[PDB]
Structure formats: structure tokens, C-alpha cells
Design a protein around this ligand. Structure first.
Ligand SMILES: Nc1ncc(-c2cccc(N3CCNCC3)c2)cc1C(=O)Nc1ccncc1
Length: 320
């Protein structure tokens, strides 16, 4: 198609802005990475999430997918509002009311996956996304793990060093408890204005053996959700309860004010509508300088003859 700009450029994939007559966002994964022994799982996994997550309001939905021999292309809806990381620098710290809006919606998003069996595990201020209306969307279903949820604890050992679950660092079996810990780090940063880790391999040690300091300015309800969400024990941690895990989150005093049936229909009013910039909304969003020009890398024949398109079959075909 016609490719307007490069949005993000991770090692596994490249995110670039496109049009065809609506603006869309495209994540392109080279096929050599995913086509191997027990590697096909990441492309397949993300598709399943995207299929299950596209109906949900908060998790981002996927228009189309196409296949070329050299790469696999994902077309995802363009969100205009902005990422939280830019918001956090525009406003060092956010009120507790703003955090309740965002964090409440995020907990709904994670529960949907938890019910479905998927662990986001890439929860970050950047991975959340804001629409022009002020709601939240979660972006990169890439590190997710799906297909095993009730009575299943599995160790895939993925996380981000700052948002990493303490139980995971230990080498222990990880449930959906990691995702809730990531929430508390998110909530922490927005309300306090700083990472809870006073911010290489030193972080893993701090998280496991250093105390978390709640700002004195923080409301007592806020301290408790942080303490319970950022709790080191997966069994003690809030919302990792096997039976009654969402109600206690939902009935926590910090999130008493919300109406979650009402908020899920986007009925509740966002605290601050994001700034309306050019139809693209490129101004509000961060601008990363890895590759300013969008030129897809020229293919090498020797790889291309090795890739099996049997594995990459049934792409271009998306279920619900
Ligand atoms: N759907 C989207 N709509 C808009 C944006 C967007 C728009 C402008 C700038 C940015 N930035 C990302 C953060 N770094 C600075 C550039 C993202 C991203 C996405 C999106 O899905 N992204 C994404 C990123 C990584 N894996 C899957 C999906």
C-alpha cells in the first residue's frame, strides 16, 4: 500500500503507518523469526488474542491480515489520542481520579483475557493507548501466552525488567498474577510520578528484596491497592485469587466509586479528552528515531526458499 511513516521498530517487528481510505497501523513480522521449531506459536498466539480481543472495547482490534513470502503483515486500527508515557511527561503526576479511570478499564481488559486464558505480560505505559475520546487501549499482544487458564500454571518466562513479576524472577511457575503486579506499577507511576523502584540486573534484586515506598502524598486507599497489587506473594496478591479475584479488586475502597458495567460501555466520562491534533494524531504520540524512512528490507533468496508456507497457512483468514 502507501506507507506514511514508521511508528515503532522493535527487534521482532516494525510498526508503520499506512493508508489504502482510512488510516491504519501495521505491525510487520519477518517470517524467519516465527518459522522454526516451536516458534510458530507467537504469530498464531497473537492472532487468537486479536480475534478474542477485537470484540472487547479496551483491547485493540484488527482490521485485516495479509501474507507475503518475506513477511507477515497485521493491520490494526489507528488510535489518535496518545500513549501514557507521553502523558506522564506532559504531567509528571496524575490525580487519583484519573488513575482510577485508566486502571479500572485496564483491570477489565486483563480479566477478559484471564477469562479467555491470555496473559498480556507486556503491560507498560507505552503499550496502553488513548483514543481521541480519552479511553484506553492495549497495543502489543505479542508477549501474550494463551490457551491454558483454569487450573494451569505455566512458565514462559517473559516480562519487562521494571514490570516483571517477582514470582517470575524467582524461576517459579507464573499464573496471571504477573499481570496484576504490572497494573500496580502502572498505577504507582501515574499517581506518584516515578517508578516504584526509585527509577541492569540490579532491578531483579531490588524488586525481590527491597521495600516499596508509597509517597506520603498518596491517599490511604491508594497505598493499599498498591500494597495488595504490588504484593510479592502470588497467593496473597490482589486479583490473583482463584475464585473471588475480581470482586475484591472491584470492591476495593479505591475503586468503589466506579460502575464497571457502566464504564465498559464507555458510558463513563474520561477525565481529560486528549488534544486533537492532525487527523493522524501523530503530534501527541512519541516519535522514535530508529528508522525515520519506511523502506521494507530487500529479500534474500536463500532464506525465502527455506521458509515453509505450509506453516504460514490460513493466514489472511481471521475468525471472530
Ligand atoms: N494501533 C496503534 N495505533 C497507533 C499507534 C501509534 C501511533 C503513533 C505513534 C506510536 N508510537 C508507539 C510508541 N513509540 C512511539 C511511536 C504508536 C500504535 C498502534 C499500535 O497498535 N502499536 C503497536 C505497537 C507495537 N505492537 C503492536 C501495536
Amino acid at each position: 500500500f502507501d506507507l506514511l511513516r514508521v511508528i515503532g521498530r522493535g527487534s521482532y517487528a516494525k510498526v508503520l503507518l499506512v493508508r489504502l481510505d482510512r488510516i491504519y497501523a501495521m505491525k510487520v513480522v519477518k517470517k524467519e523469526l516465527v518459522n522454526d521449531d516451536e516458534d510458530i506459536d507467537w504469530v498464531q498466539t497473537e492472532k487468537h488474542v486479536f480475534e478474542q480481543a477485537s470484540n472487547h472495547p479496551f483491547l485493540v482490534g484488527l482490521h485485516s491480515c495479509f501474507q507475503t513470502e518475506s513477511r507477515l503483515f497485521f493491520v490494526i486500527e489507528y488510535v489518535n489520542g496518545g500513549d501514557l508515557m507521553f502523558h506522564m511527561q506532559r504531567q509528571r503526576k496524575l490525580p487519583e481520579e484519573h488513575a482510577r479511570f485508566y486502571s479500572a478499564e485496564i483491570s477489565l481488559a486483563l480479566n477478559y483475557l484471564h477469562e479467555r486464558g491470555i496473559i498480556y505480560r507486556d503491560l507498560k505505559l507505552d503499550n496502553v493507548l488513548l483514543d481521541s475520546e480519552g479511553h484506553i487501549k492495549l497495543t502489543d499482544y505479542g508477549m501474550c501466552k494463551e490457551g491454558l487458564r483454569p487450573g494451569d500454571t505455566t512458565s514462559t518466562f517473559c516480562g519487562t525488567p521494571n514490570y516483571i513479576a517477582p514470582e517470575i524472577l524467582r524461576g517459579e511457575d507464573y499464573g496471571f498474577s504477573v499481570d496484576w503486579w504490572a497494573l500496580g506499577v502502572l498505577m504507582f507511576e501515574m499517581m506518584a510520578g516515578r517508578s516504584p523502584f526509585d527509577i541492569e540486573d540490579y532491578l531483579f534484586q531490588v524488586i525481590l528484596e527491597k521495600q516499596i515506598r508509597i509517597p506520603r502524598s498518596l491517599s490511604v486507599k491508594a497505598a493499599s491497592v498498591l500494597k495488595s497489587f504490588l504484593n510479592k506473594d502470588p497467593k496473597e496478591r490482589l486479583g490473583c485469587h482463584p475464585q473471588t479475584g475480581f470482586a475484591d479488586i472491584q470492591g476495593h475502597p479505591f475503586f468503589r466509586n466506579v460502575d464497571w458495567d457502566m464504564m465498559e460501555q464507555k458510558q463513563v466520562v474520561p477525565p481529560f479528552k486528549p488534544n486533537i491534533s492532525g487527523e493522524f494524531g501523530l503530534d501527541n504520540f512519541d516519535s522514535q528515531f530508529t528508522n525515520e524512512p519506511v523502506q521494507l528490507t530487500p529479500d534474500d533468496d536463500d532464506i525465502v526458499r527455506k521458509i515453509d508456507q505450509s506453516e504460514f497457512e490460513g493466514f489472511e483468514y481471521i475468525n471472530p
